[PDB]
Amino acid sequence: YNNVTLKNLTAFQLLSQRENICELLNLVESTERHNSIINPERQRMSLEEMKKMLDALK
Amino acid sequence: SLPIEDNYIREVVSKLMECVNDAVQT
Amino acid sequence: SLPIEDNYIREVVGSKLMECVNDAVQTLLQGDDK
Amino acid sequence: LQEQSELMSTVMNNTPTTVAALAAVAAASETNGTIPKPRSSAQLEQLLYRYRAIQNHPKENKLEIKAIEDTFRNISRDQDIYETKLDTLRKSIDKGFQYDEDLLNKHLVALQLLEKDTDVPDYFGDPDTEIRISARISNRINELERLPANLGTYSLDDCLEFITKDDLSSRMDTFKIKALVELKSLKLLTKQKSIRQKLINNVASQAHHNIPYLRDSPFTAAAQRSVQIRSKVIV
Amino acid sequence: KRILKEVILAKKVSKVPINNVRAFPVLQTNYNGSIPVVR
């Protein structure tokens, strides 16, 4: 799995290409790949950490 | 128990509507 | 082209969704209103 | 110790009275493990008939004669039970069923193919399974290497040829050829595999110069272009 | 085999289709040649 092949590159391009046309008709959820990457509690924890760094550097 | 010829043996021997309703809307 | 062990192989050892998506794209590429 | 084959060897040697397998308490009981009830039609029953007919003269030196007579009583009892069941079966036949033809054609082809141990369809790596293929290939090889070479044919179409006492009709070896084509195709099986390996590894080793959709690919065309880059010189 | 035999014996199947090779193998004569073997 360290290297890529012709079939691997073609299958990678095909899996990256089908999921774009799959979202226009909206027949897939694609919410677990959304919320686990956004993570709004992690975002507000990030804002609290930047505010804590402001309070520590002032 | 008589054999039979080979020429007689060789002679005897919801996914559609999931896209249409989405293509009408979008 | 000689079937020899093809009898013995048979003795021993006895999608649609993306086609519908492609047909939906082919129907969407007909009218300009969509 | 092949008690059913020792009597056949003594009958084929034409000397079944001088020894008669020497049936005693240590010899007739060691090869049997009461005779073991052979299942042949007449190839092992007429040998028992001859074995009874020869030993009527000593009349005391053999003690298994009572077991052979009990086996014959069992055979006669089974024959009488089979005749009574055949009479009951022929008297228990219904008058009308109107048995179809298509199911009869389905049964006869399957029952013909299941006689001589070949594959029949329904229509109603891995080295562990390759030895089982080779054992079925060698089975048919050892079966075809036991056929007599003096095999001739007689079709039902020779009556228009008027074969005399010395005629030599041209339809005598129609099955001797087909009995050798299979025997010499099961031996050239490893011979054709070398030609197939020399063909497939020469038509599929490139796979990007004759096939159009594999040479018209953006990755393959860029790769074949980029493997021919000559090295840059310095100054 | 006995059941399909008794169906033919009793029910009198109207067609009974014939599917045979119209041939059967026999044993033929073998004989050595009359010209002697030279060494």
Side-chain angles (χ1 to χ4, degrees), chain E residues 3-32:
Chain E
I3 293 168
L4 293 175
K5 180 177 72 176
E6 291 292 327
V7 169
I8 298 170
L9 286 170
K11 302 300 289 183
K12 292 181 175 66
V13 178
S14 296
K15 289 178 70 68
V16 189
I18 297 169
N19 291 317
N20 292 318
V21 299
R22 293 179 66 188
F24 58 96
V26 296
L27 294 172
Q28 66 182 356
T29 60
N30 49 3
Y31 63 95
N32 289 318

PDB file of all heavy atoms in Angstrom, chain E residues 3-32:
ATOM      1  N   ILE E   3     -38.747 -48.047 -10.792  1.00  0.00           N
ATOM      2  CA  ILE E   3     -39.934 -47.199 -10.920  1.00  0.00           C
ATOM      3  C   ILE E   3     -40.156 -46.788 -12.374  1.00  0.00           C
ATOM      4  O   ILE E   3     -41.270 -46.906 -12.904  1.00  0.00           O
ATOM      5  CB  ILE E   3     -39.823 -45.976  -9.990  1.00  0.00           C
ATOM      6  CG1 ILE E   3     -39.874 -46.421  -8.527  1.00  0.00           C
ATOM      7  CG2 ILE E   3     -40.935 -44.971 -10.271  1.00  0.00           C
ATOM      8  CD1 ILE E   3     -39.486 -45.342  -7.544  1.00  0.00           C
ATOM      9  N   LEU E   4     -39.097 -46.335 -13.053  1.00  0.00           N
ATOM     10  CA  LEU E   4     -39.209 -45.972 -14.462  1.00  0.00           C
ATOM     11  C   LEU E   4     -39.399 -47.187 -15.362  1.00  0.00           C
ATOM     12  O   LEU E   4     -39.876 -47.036 -16.491  1.00  0.00           O
ATOM     13  CB  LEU E   4     -37.977 -45.185 -14.906  1.00  0.00           C
ATOM     14  CG  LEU E   4     -37.817 -43.806 -14.266  1.00  0.00           C
ATOM     15  CD1 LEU E   4     -36.502 -43.169 -14.689  1.00  0.00           C
ATOM     16  CD2 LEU E   4     -38.998 -42.909 -14.616  1.00  0.00           C
ATOM     17  N   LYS E   5     -39.029 -48.379 -14.895  1.00  0.00           N
ATOM     18  CA  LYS E   5     -39.370 -49.593 -15.625  1.00  0.00           C
ATOM     19  C   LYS E   5     -40.855 -49.912 -15.499  1.00  0.00           C
ATOM     20  O   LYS E   5     -41.512 -50.243 -16.493  1.00  0.00           O
ATOM     21  CB  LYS E   5     -38.522 -50.752 -15.112  1.00  0.00           C
ATOM     22  CG  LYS E   5     -38.788 -52.073 -15.792  1.00  0.00           C
ATOM     23  CD  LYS E   5     -37.845 -53.132 -15.265  1.00  0.00           C
ATOM     24  CE  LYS E   5     -38.216 -53.519 -13.841  1.00  0.00           C
ATOM     25  NZ  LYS E   5     -37.365 -54.632 -13.334  1.00  0.00           N
ATOM     26  N   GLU E   6     -41.404 -49.806 -14.286  1.00  0.00           N
ATOM     27  CA  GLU E   6     -42.812 -50.121 -14.071  1.00  0.00           C
ATOM     28  C   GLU E   6     -43.749 -49.084 -14.678  1.00  0.00           C
ATOM     29  O   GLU E   6     -44.880 -49.436 -15.030  1.00  0.00           O
ATOM     30  CB  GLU E   6     -43.102 -50.278 -12.578  1.00  0.00           C
ATOM     31  CG  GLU E   6     -42.462 -51.509 -11.951  1.00  0.00           C
ATOM     32  CD  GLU E   6     -43.069 -52.808 -12.451  1.00  0.00           C
ATOM     33  OE1 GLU E   6     -44.284 -52.829 -12.741  1.00  0.00           O
ATOM     34  OE2 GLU E   6     -42.329 -53.810 -12.551  1.00  0.00           O
ATOM     35  N   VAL E   7     -43.304 -47.830 -14.821  1.00  0.00           N
ATOM     36  CA  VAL E   7     -44.099 -46.833 -15.542  1.00  0.00           C
ATOM     37  C   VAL E   7     -44.261 -47.234 -17.007  1.00  0.00           C
ATOM     38  O   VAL E   7     -45.361 -47.153 -17.569  1.00  0.00           O
ATOM     39  CB  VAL E   7     -43.472 -45.432 -15.390  1.00  0.00           C
ATOM     40  CG1 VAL E   7     -44.114 -44.428 -16.342  1.00  0.00           C
ATOM     41  CG2 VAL E   7     -43.646 -44.935 -13.968  1.00  0.00           C
ATOM     42  N   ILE E   8     -43.187 -47.732 -17.625  1.00  0.00           N
ATOM     43  CA  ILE E   8     -43.261 -48.220 -19.000  1.00  0.00           C
ATOM     44  C   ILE E   8     -44.090 -49.501 -19.075  1.00  0.00           C
ATOM     45  O   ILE E   8     -44.868 -49.701 -20.019  1.00  0.00           O
ATOM     46  CB  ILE E   8     -41.835 -48.413 -19.554  1.00  0.00           C
ATOM     47  CG1 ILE E   8     -41.100 -47.071 -19.587  1.00  0.00           C
ATOM     48  CG2 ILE E   8     -41.844 -49.020 -20.948  1.00  0.00           C
ATOM     49  CD1 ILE E   8     -39.620 -47.187 -19.876  1.00  0.00           C
ATOM     50  N   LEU E   9     -43.971 -50.366 -18.063  1.00  0.00           N
ATOM     51  CA  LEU E   9     -44.703 -51.633 -18.067  1.00  0.00           C
ATOM     52  C   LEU E   9     -46.205 -51.434 -17.874  1.00  0.00           C
ATOM     53  O   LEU E   9     -47.008 -52.208 -18.409  1.00  0.00           O
ATOM     54  CB  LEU E   9     -44.154 -52.566 -16.987  1.00  0.00           C
ATOM     55  CG  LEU E   9     -42.802 -53.240 -17.215  1.00  0.00           C
ATOM     56  CD1 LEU E   9     -42.325 -53.915 -15.943  1.00  0.00           C
ATOM     57  CD2 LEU E   9     -42.930 -54.262 -18.327  1.00  0.00           C
ATOM     58  N   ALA E  10     -46.612 -50.413 -17.122  1.00  0.00           N
ATOM     59  CA  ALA E  10     -48.012 -50.256 -16.753  1.00  0.00           C
ATOM     60  C   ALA E  10     -48.704 -49.092 -17.446  1.00  0.00           C
ATOM     61  O   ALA E  10     -49.754 -49.284 -18.067  1.00  0.00           O
ATOM     62  CB  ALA E  10     -48.129 -50.086 -15.233  1.00  0.00           C
ATOM     63  N   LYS E  11     -48.143 -47.885 -17.355  1.00  0.00           N
ATOM     64  CA  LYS E  11     -48.871 -46.691 -17.766  1.00  0.00           C
ATOM     65  C   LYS E  11     -48.925 -46.527 -19.280  1.00  0.00           C
ATOM     66  O   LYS E  11     -49.777 -45.778 -19.774  1.00  0.00           O
ATOM     67  CB  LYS E  11     -48.245 -45.452 -17.123  1.00  0.00           C
ATOM     68  CG  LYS E  11     -48.221 -45.503 -15.603  1.00  0.00           C
ATOM     69  CD  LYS E  11     -49.622 -45.625 -15.022  1.00  0.00           C
ATOM     70  CE  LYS E  11     -50.419 -44.343 -15.192  1.00  0.00           C
ATOM     71  NZ  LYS E  11     -51.760 -44.447 -14.550  1.00  0.00           N
ATOM     72  N   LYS E  12     -48.035 -47.214 -20.010  1.00  0.00           N
ATOM     73  CA  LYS E  12     -47.969 -47.227 -21.478  1.00  0.00           C
ATOM     74  C   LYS E  12     -47.780 -45.812 -22.036  1.00  0.00           C
ATOM     75  O   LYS E  12     -48.690 -45.207 -22.610  1.00  0.00           O
ATOM     76  CB  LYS E  12     -49.196 -47.919 -22.091  1.00  0.00           C
ATOM     77  CG  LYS E  12     -49.255 -49.416 -21.822  1.00  0.00           C
ATOM     78  CD  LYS E  12     -50.472 -50.054 -22.471  1.00  0.00           C
ATOM     79  CE  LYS E  12     -50.459 -51.565 -22.297  1.00  0.00           C
ATOM     80  NZ  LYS E  12     -50.613 -51.961 -20.870  1.00  0.00           N
ATOM     81  N   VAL E  13     -46.578 -45.283 -21.766  1.00  0.00           N
ATOM     82  CA  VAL E  13     -46.189 -43.947 -22.212  1.00  0.00           C
ATOM     83  C   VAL E  13     -46.285 -43.842 -23.732  1.00  0.00           C
ATOM     84  O   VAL E  13     -45.777 -44.696 -24.471  1.00  0.00           O
ATOM     85  CB  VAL E  13     -44.769 -43.630 -21.711  1.00  0.00           C
ATOM     86  CG1 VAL E  13     -44.311 -42.262 -22.192  1.00  0.00           C
ATOM     87  CG2 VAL E  13     -44.712 -43.714 -20.190  1.00  0.00           C
ATOM     88  N   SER E  14     -46.959 -42.786 -24.200  1.00  0.00           N
ATOM     89  CA  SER E  14     -47.431 -42.716 -25.579  1.00  0.00           C
ATOM     90  C   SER E  14     -46.319 -42.491 -26.597  1.00  0.00           C
ATOM     91  O   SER E  14     -46.486 -42.869 -27.761  1.00  0.00           O
ATOM     92  CB  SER E  14     -48.478 -41.609 -25.713  1.00  0.00           C
ATOM     93  OG  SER E  14     -49.628 -41.894 -24.935  1.00  0.00           O
ATOM     94  N   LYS E  15     -45.195 -41.891 -26.205  1.00  0.00           N
ATOM     95  CA  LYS E  15     -44.139 -41.577 -27.161  1.00  0.00           C
ATOM     96  C   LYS E  15     -42.905 -42.451 -26.979  1.00  0.00           C
ATOM     97  O   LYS E  15     -42.568 -43.210 -27.895  1.00  0.00           O
ATOM     98  CB  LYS E  15     -43.756 -40.094 -27.058  1.00  0.00           C
ATOM     99  CG  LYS E  15     -44.811 -39.139 -27.589  1.00  0.00           C
ATOM    100  CD  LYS E  15     -44.376 -37.694 -27.417  1.00  0.00           C
ATOM    101  CE  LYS E  15     -43.227 -37.345 -28.354  1.00  0.00           C
ATOM    102  NZ  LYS E  15     -43.646 -37.330 -29.784  1.00  0.00           N
ATOM    103  N   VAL E  16     -42.278 -42.403 -25.800  1.00  0.00           N
ATOM    104  CA  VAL E  16     -41.011 -43.059 -25.455  1.00  0.00           C
ATOM    105  C   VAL E  16     -39.962 -42.703 -26.509  1.00  0.00           C
ATOM    106  O   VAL E  16     -39.722 -43.497 -27.433  1.00  0.00           O
ATOM    107  CB  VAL E  16     -41.184 -44.580 -25.284  1.00  0.00           C
ATOM    108  CG1 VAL E  16     -39.911 -45.224 -24.720  1.00  0.00           C
ATOM    109  CG2 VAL E  16     -42.379 -44.884 -24.395  1.00  0.00           C
ATOM    110  N   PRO E  17     -39.392 -41.496 -26.469  1.00  0.00           N
ATOM    111  CA  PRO E  17     -38.502 -41.059 -27.556  1.00  0.00           C
ATOM    112  C   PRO E  17     -37.194 -41.839 -27.587  1.00  0.00           C
ATOM    113  O   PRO E  17     -36.592 -42.129 -26.550  1.00  0.00           O
ATOM    114  CB  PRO E  17     -38.261 -39.579 -27.239  1.00  0.00           C
ATOM    115  CG  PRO E  17     -38.445 -39.480 -25.763  1.00  0.00           C
ATOM    116  CD  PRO E  17     -39.517 -40.476 -25.412  1.00  0.00           C
ATOM    117  N   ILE E  18     -36.768 -42.183 -28.799  1.00  0.00           N
ATOM    118  CA  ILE E  18     -35.568 -42.978 -29.025  1.00  0.00           C
ATOM    119  C   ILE E  18     -34.395 -42.027 -29.217  1.00  0.00           C
ATOM    120  O   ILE E  18     -34.395 -41.208 -30.145  1.00  0.00           O
ATOM    121  CB  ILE E  18     -35.730 -43.906 -30.239  1.00  0.00           C
ATOM    122  CG1 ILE E  18     -36.858 -44.911 -29.998  1.00  0.00           C
ATOM    123  CG2 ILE E  18     -34.423 -44.627 -30.539  1.00  0.00           C
ATOM    124  CD1 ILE E  18     -37.258 -45.687 -31.234  1.00  0.00           C
ATOM    125  N   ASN E  19     -33.398 -42.132 -28.339  1.00  0.00           N
ATOM    126  CA  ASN E  19     -32.190 -41.310 -28.401  1.00  0.00           C
ATOM    127  C   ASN E  19     -30.997 -42.238 -28.193  1.00  0.00           C
ATOM    128  O   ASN E  19     -30.550 -42.447 -27.062  1.00  0.00           O
ATOM    129  CB  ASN E  19     -32.235 -40.195 -27.363  1.00  0.00           C
ATOM    130  CG  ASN E  19     -33.281 -39.146 -27.685  1.00  0.00           C
ATOM    131  OD1 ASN E  19     -33.422 -38.726 -28.833  1.00  0.00           O
ATOM    132  ND2 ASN E  19     -34.031 -38.728 -26.672  1.00  0.00           N
ATOM    133  N   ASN E  20     -30.482 -42.789 -29.289  1.00  0.00           N
ATOM    134  CA  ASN E  20     -29.391 -43.749 -29.243  1.00  0.00           C
ATOM    135  C   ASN E  20     -28.358 -43.406 -30.307  1.00  0.00           C
ATOM    136  O   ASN E  20     -28.652 -42.727 -31.294  1.00  0.00           O
ATOM    137  CB  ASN E  20     -29.899 -45.184 -29.447  1.00  0.00           C
ATOM    138  CG  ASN E  20     -30.737 -45.675 -28.283  1.00  0.00           C
ATOM    139  OD1 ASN E  20     -30.406 -45.437 -27.122  1.00  0.00           O
ATOM    140  ND2 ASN E  20     -31.828 -46.366 -28.590  1.00  0.00           N
ATOM    141  N   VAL E  21     -27.132 -43.894 -30.091  1.00  0.00           N
ATOM    142  CA  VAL E  21     -26.040 -43.653 -31.033  1.00  0.00           C
ATOM    143  C   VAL E  21     -26.067 -44.592 -32.227  1.00  0.00           C
ATOM    144  O   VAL E  21     -25.267 -44.404 -33.154  1.00  0.00           O
ATOM    145  CB  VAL E  21     -24.673 -43.782 -30.335  1.00  0.00           C
ATOM    146  CG1 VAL E  21     -24.538 -42.750 -29.228  1.00  0.00           C
ATOM    147  CG2 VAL E  21     -24.492 -45.185 -29.784  1.00  0.00           C
ATOM    148  N   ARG E  22     -26.956 -45.596 -32.213  1.00  0.00           N
ATOM    149  CA  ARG E  22     -27.124 -46.601 -33.274  1.00  0.00           C
ATOM    150  C   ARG E  22     -25.837 -47.376 -33.555  1.00  0.00           C
ATOM    151  O   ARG E  22     -25.582 -47.784 -34.691  1.00  0.00           O
ATOM    152  CB  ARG E  22     -27.671 -45.980 -34.566  1.00  0.00           C
ATOM    153  CG  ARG E  22     -29.096 -45.459 -34.456  1.00  0.00           C
ATOM    154  CD  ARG E  22     -29.561 -44.836 -35.763  1.00  0.00           C
ATOM    155  NE  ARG E  22     -29.675 -45.825 -36.831  1.00  0.00           N
ATOM    156  CZ  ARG E  22     -29.906 -45.524 -38.106  1.00  0.00           C
ATOM    157  NH1 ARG E  22     -30.048 -44.259 -38.477  1.00  0.00           N
ATOM    158  NH2 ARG E  22     -29.995 -46.491 -39.011  1.00  0.00           N
ATOM    159  N   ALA E  23     -25.027 -47.596 -32.521  1.00  0.00           N
ATOM    160  CA  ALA E  23     -23.768 -48.316 -32.656  1.00  0.00           C
ATOM    161  C   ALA E  23     -23.389 -48.896 -31.302  1.00  0.00           C
ATOM    162  O   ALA E  23     -23.869 -48.446 -30.258  1.00  0.00           O
ATOM    163  CB  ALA E  23     -22.650 -47.410 -33.185  1.00  0.00           C
ATOM    164  N   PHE E  24     -22.518 -49.906 -31.335  1.00  0.00           N
ATOM    165  CA  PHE E  24     -22.026 -50.546 -30.124  1.00  0.00           C
ATOM    166  C   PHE E  24     -20.670 -51.179 -30.405  1.00  0.00           C
ATOM    167  O   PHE E  24     -20.487 -51.787 -31.470  1.00  0.00           O
ATOM    168  CB  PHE E  24     -23.014 -51.592 -29.574  1.00  0.00           C
ATOM    169  CG  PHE E  24     -23.364 -52.699 -30.541  1.00  0.00           C
ATOM    170  CD1 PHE E  24     -22.695 -53.915 -30.504  1.00  0.00           C
ATOM    171  CD2 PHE E  24     -24.405 -52.542 -31.448  1.00  0.00           C
ATOM    172  CE1 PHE E  24     -23.028 -54.935 -31.380  1.00  0.00           C
ATOM    173  CE2 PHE E  24     -24.741 -53.558 -32.327  1.00  0.00           C
ATOM    174  CZ  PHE E  24     -24.054 -54.755 -32.289  1.00  0.00           C
ATOM    175  N   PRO E  25     -19.704 -51.037 -29.497  1.00  0.00           N
ATOM    176  CA  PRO E  25     -18.358 -51.559 -29.763  1.00  0.00           C
ATOM    177  C   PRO E  25     -18.282 -53.068 -29.591  1.00  0.00           C
ATOM    178  O   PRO E  25     -18.896 -53.648 -28.691  1.00  0.00           O
ATOM    179  CB  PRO E  25     -17.490 -50.838 -28.725  1.00  0.00           C
ATOM    180  CG  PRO E  25     -18.424 -50.553 -27.599  1.00  0.00           C
ATOM    181  CD  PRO E  25     -19.765 -50.283 -28.231  1.00  0.00           C
ATOM    182  N   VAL E  26     -17.518 -53.705 -30.479  1.00  0.00           N
ATOM    183  CA  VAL E  26     -17.277 -55.140 -30.445  1.00  0.00           C
ATOM    184  C   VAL E  26     -15.771 -55.374 -30.456  1.00  0.00           C
ATOM    185  O   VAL E  26     -14.975 -54.458 -30.666  1.00  0.00           O
ATOM    186  CB  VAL E  26     -17.941 -55.878 -31.627  1.00  0.00           C
ATOM    187  CG1 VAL E  26     -19.456 -55.756 -31.563  1.00  0.00           C
ATOM    188  CG2 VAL E  26     -17.416 -55.333 -32.945  1.00  0.00           C
ATOM    189  N   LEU E  27     -15.389 -56.627 -30.230  1.00  0.00           N
ATOM    190  CA  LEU E  27     -13.994 -57.035 -30.300  1.00  0.00           C
ATOM    191  C   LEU E  27     -13.701 -57.628 -31.672  1.00  0.00           C
ATOM    192  O   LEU E  27     -14.451 -58.474 -32.168  1.00  0.00           O
ATOM    193  CB  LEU E  27     -13.675 -58.046 -29.198  1.00  0.00           C
ATOM    194  CG  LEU E  27     -13.762 -57.493 -27.772  1.00  0.00           C
ATOM    195  CD1 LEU E  27     -13.635 -58.599 -26.735  1.00  0.00           C
ATOM    196  CD2 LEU E  27     -12.700 -56.427 -27.552  1.00  0.00           C
ATOM    197  N   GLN E  28     -12.608 -57.177 -32.283  1.00  0.00           N
ATOM    198  CA  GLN E  28     -12.243 -57.586 -33.631  1.00  0.00           C
ATOM    199  C   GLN E  28     -11.015 -58.487 -33.591  1.00  0.00           C
ATOM    200  O   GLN E  28     -10.336 -58.607 -32.567  1.00  0.00           O
ATOM    201  CB  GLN E  28     -11.975 -56.373 -34.534  1.00  0.00           C
ATOM    202  CG  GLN E  28     -10.757 -55.555 -34.142  1.00  0.00           C
ATOM    203  CD  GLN E  28     -10.557 -54.346 -35.035  1.00  0.00           C
ATOM    204  OE1 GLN E  28     -11.295 -54.145 -36.001  1.00  0.00           O
ATOM    205  NE2 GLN E  28      -9.557 -53.532 -34.717  1.00  0.00           N
ATOM    206  N   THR E  29     -10.735 -59.116 -34.730  1.00  0.00           N
ATOM    207  CA  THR E  29      -9.653 -60.088 -34.807  1.00  0.00           C
ATOM    208  C   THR E  29      -8.292 -59.406 -34.841  1.00  0.00           C
ATOM    209  O   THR E  29      -8.098 -58.391 -35.517  1.00  0.00           O
ATOM    210  CB  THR E  29      -9.815 -60.966 -36.046  1.00  0.00           C
ATOM    211  OG1 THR E  29      -9.792 -60.147 -37.222  1.00  0.00           O
ATOM    212  CG2 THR E  29     -11.121 -61.725 -35.988  1.00  0.00           C
ATOM    213  N   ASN E  30      -7.345 -59.977 -34.104  1.00  0.00           N
ATOM    214  CA  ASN E  30      -5.948 -59.577 -34.152  1.00  0.00           C
ATOM    215  C   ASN E  30      -5.093 -60.724 -34.682  1.00  0.00           C
ATOM    216  O   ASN E  30      -5.358 -61.896 -34.398  1.00  0.00           O
ATOM    217  CB  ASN E  30      -5.460 -59.106 -32.772  1.00  0.00           C
ATOM    218  CG  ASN E  30      -5.806 -60.076 -31.645  1.00  0.00           C
ATOM    219  OD1 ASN E  30      -6.365 -61.150 -31.866  1.00  0.00           O
ATOM    220  ND2 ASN E  30      -5.481 -59.684 -30.419  1.00  0.00           N
ATOM    221  N   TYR E  31      -4.085 -60.381 -35.480  1.00  0.00           N
ATOM    222  CA  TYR E  31      -3.225 -61.384 -36.090  1.00  0.00           C
ATOM    223  C   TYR E  31      -1.874 -60.759 -36.401  1.00  0.00           C
ATOM    224  O   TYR E  31      -1.802 -59.617 -36.863  1.00  0.00           O
ATOM    225  CB  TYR E  31      -3.863 -61.979 -37.359  1.00  0.00           C
ATOM    226  CG  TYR E  31      -4.107 -61.001 -38.492  1.00  0.00           C
ATOM    227  CD1 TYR E  31      -3.182 -60.849 -39.523  1.00  0.00           C
ATOM    228  CD2 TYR E  31      -5.282 -60.257 -38.553  1.00  0.00           C
ATOM    229  CE1 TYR E  31      -3.406 -59.964 -40.560  1.00  0.00           C
ATOM    230  CE2 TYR E  31      -5.515 -59.371 -39.588  1.00  0.00           C
ATOM    231  CZ  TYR E  31      -4.575 -59.230 -40.587  1.00  0.00           C
ATOM    232  OH  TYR E  31      -4.809 -58.349 -41.619  1.00  0.00           O
ATOM    233  N   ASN E  32      -0.810 -61.510 -36.139  1.00  0.00           N
ATOM    234  CA  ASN E  32       0.527 -61.027 -36.436  1.00  0.00           C
ATOM    235  C   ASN E  32       0.819 -61.150 -37.928  1.00  0.00           C
ATOM    236  O   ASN E  32       0.170 -61.907 -38.657  1.00  0.00           O
ATOM    237  CB  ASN E  32       1.569 -61.794 -35.622  1.00  0.00           C
ATOM    238  CG  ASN E  32       1.525 -61.448 -34.145  1.00  0.00           C
ATOM    239  OD1 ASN E  32       1.383 -60.283 -33.773  1.00  0.00           O
ATOM    240  ND2 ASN E  32       1.643 -62.461 -33.295  1.00  0.00           N
TER     241      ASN E  32
END
